[PDB]
Amino acid sequence: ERTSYLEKKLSCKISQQIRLELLKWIEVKAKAKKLQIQPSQLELFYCLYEMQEEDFVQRAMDYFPKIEINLSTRMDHMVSSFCIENCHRVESLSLGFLHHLTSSFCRGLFSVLSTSQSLTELDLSDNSLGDPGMRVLCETLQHPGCNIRRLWLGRCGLSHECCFDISLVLSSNQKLVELDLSDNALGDFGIRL
Amino acid sequence: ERTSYLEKKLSCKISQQIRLELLKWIEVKAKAKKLQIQPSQLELFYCLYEMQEEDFVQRAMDYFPKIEINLSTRMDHMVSSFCIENCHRVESLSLGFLHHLTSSFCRGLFSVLSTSQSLTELDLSDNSLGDPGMRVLCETLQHPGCNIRRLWLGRCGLSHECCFDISLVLSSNQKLVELDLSDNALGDFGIRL
Secondary structure, eight states: OOOGGGTTTSOHHHHHHHHHHHHHHHHHHHTOOSOOSSSOHHHHHHHHHTTOOHHHHHHHHTTOSEEEOOBOSHHHHHHHHHHHTTOSSOOEEEOOBOOOOSHHHHHHHHHHHHTOSSOOEEEOOSSOOOHHHHHHHHHHHTSTTOOOOEEEOTTOOOOGGGHHHHHHHHHHOSOOOEEEOOSOOOOHHHHHO | OOOGGGTTTSOHHHHHHHHHHHHHHHHHHHTOOSOOSSSOHHHHHHHHHTTOOHHHHHHHHTTOSEEEOOBOSHHHHHHHHHHHTTOSSOOEEEOOBOOOOSHHHHHHHHHHHHTOSSOOEEEOOSSOOOHHHHHHHHHHHTSTTOOOOEEEOTTOOOOGGGHHHHHHHHHHOSOOOEEEOOSOOOOHHHHHO
């Protein structure tokens, strides 16, 4: 840390050894098949966000094939945003909302997905993401380079008026191959759009 | 009438004189400025529909600059349909519904308007014409040759889902110059469409 007398009284020999041990530990927890509740993926990202080191988080998070995130607070959005913005090996991604669904908040995190090349699948099912939240999602999907192929939107709070935006991304983006809208209260008008 | 012994026992001399007198009478009632309740425009069309003579109704109804019609029954739709289908001098037209709003009924009358060259104004305001009725109206408006310029749709039972059809006729027909949608319960989504 950039503090004057908090850098040069400590020893780099142990810190460098600590860095490798922490890097090794992240892989150990990431490869832990058992559902250890306390070292959750979100908790690791809290430590990873505290790194503020560009190259270290690049190699440390490269041990994340599948990402499953549940979010509760505004700070939870930025800690996750700093991770996904440089995760170049993510294949499947998901979000969990329990509360920030306004376009002034979810836009920052959703803008990350559109700029992620390795991203292929987005699982937003079983959420209360409303139409205004759905509207900003389609705005990000229209961004060129969005490599998302399959999105699951089951049990979402989507209504008929959301289908207008979804028709736009289909008419623009050619990357979507699989679309799921199961368990939505959209009528015949929604299919018409 | 094509009955055998109902043509050749009566005298054509009086009937020809009657034809001119009836033709004169229609103009007399048509030019009557006072609001004589009993010889209403609909009542005259009942007599005009009973003509079944193509050329006579052409010249007889040419004394109709403004047409104001109120309809109640299915038979009322066909008597009016037979008139408007050959009225080549109509400028302003209107309808009155009090009950046949299903597309299986109003389509026959609405198909007449699209094929009327002289027609310029359509006043459908203050009616309970719903979205399914509005949908078939936009289907007829897309027909080429529809010379309707100004339509008034105030106080109609139109909802948000009707605006999808109206956006189509605008994107296709270039004849509309004035559109009125005052007093409708369409939200921000309706304007969005």
